[PDB]
Amino acid sequence: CPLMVKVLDAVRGSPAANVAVKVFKKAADGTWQDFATGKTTEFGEIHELTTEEQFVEGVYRVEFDTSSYWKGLGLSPFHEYADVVFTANDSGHRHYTIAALLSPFSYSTTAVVS
Amino acid sequence: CPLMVKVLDAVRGSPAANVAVKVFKKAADGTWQDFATGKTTEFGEIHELTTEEQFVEGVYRVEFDTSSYWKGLGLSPFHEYADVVFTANDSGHRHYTIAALLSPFSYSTTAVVS
Structure with missing residues (x-):
């Protein structure tokens, strides 16, 4: 897919399963329209989030909703999560x-453009 | 201050200066109301963002943002910006x-609560 x-x-030192991922697209109204959404598999991946034809030039926001991801461990009482906002295909078509990388108090998001 | x-x-291996920081508070309407804002100093710090009395129990969203911050090294552009959303003081009062930690394609945000 164009967006993985x-x-x-x-x-736990392993892919994160069941972490809810929400994607948005910034409409010309300066408003975030819902775009895609899923939940990581046992390999911390989501398959078929969006299609090459559906994922167009635009500002996107990828939110890793982990509010309760560490609920069973009794770890994050401050309910942390994060967003990444990049500009997708302002120069051709890409992937x-x-x-x-998730921890109760720290978040790490790297974008590998190719 | 309560929020630093x-x-x-x-x-570059040094504190980041002049990176815009925008804080938001989630109103009961489920909408993000602008809260505070500044730009990091030569020590990557913002002084007097908010006051102990102004920073109350609520859901906050801190957004770091840069503007051609890497222009000078001749690297590649990638409009990326990140957010952190934690829930403040859901018991007592804290700091x-x-x-x-910024890089052209990667963002690390760590919340030290104390």
């Missing part, structure tokens, strides 16, 4: 991989 | 320090 995610759990 | 920022430049 790869989430890692730093506390993006938003690689994230 | 500490921005580091991973490509938060949102430490961020």
Whole structure:
């Protein structure tokens, strides 16, 4: 797919499964329209988030909603999560991989553009 | 102050100066109301963002943002900006320090609560 995610759990040392990922597109109204959405598989990946034809030039926001991801461990009482906002295909057509690393208090998102 | 920022430049290896920081508070309407704002100093810090009395129990969203911050090294542009959304004081009162580490394609944000 043009837009892929790869989430890692730093506390368990393994891909993060079931972490909800939400994507948005900034409409010309300066407003964030809902775009895609899924939940990581046992490999911290989401398959078929969007299509090459659906993912067009635009500002996107990838939110790693982890509010309760560490609920069973009794770890993050401050309910942390993060966003990444990049400009997708302001020069041809490409592929993006938003690689994230999760910890109760720290978030790490790297975009591998290719 | 109750809410402090500490921005580091991973490509230059020094505190990040002049990176815009925008804070938001989630109103009961589920909407983000502008809260505070500034630009990091030569120490990657913002002084007197908000006051102990102004920073109340609520959901905040800190957004770091840059403007051709890497222009000078001759690297590649990639409009990327990140957000952190934590829930403040859901018991008592505290001091938060949102430490961020910038790179052209990667963002690390760590919240030190104390």
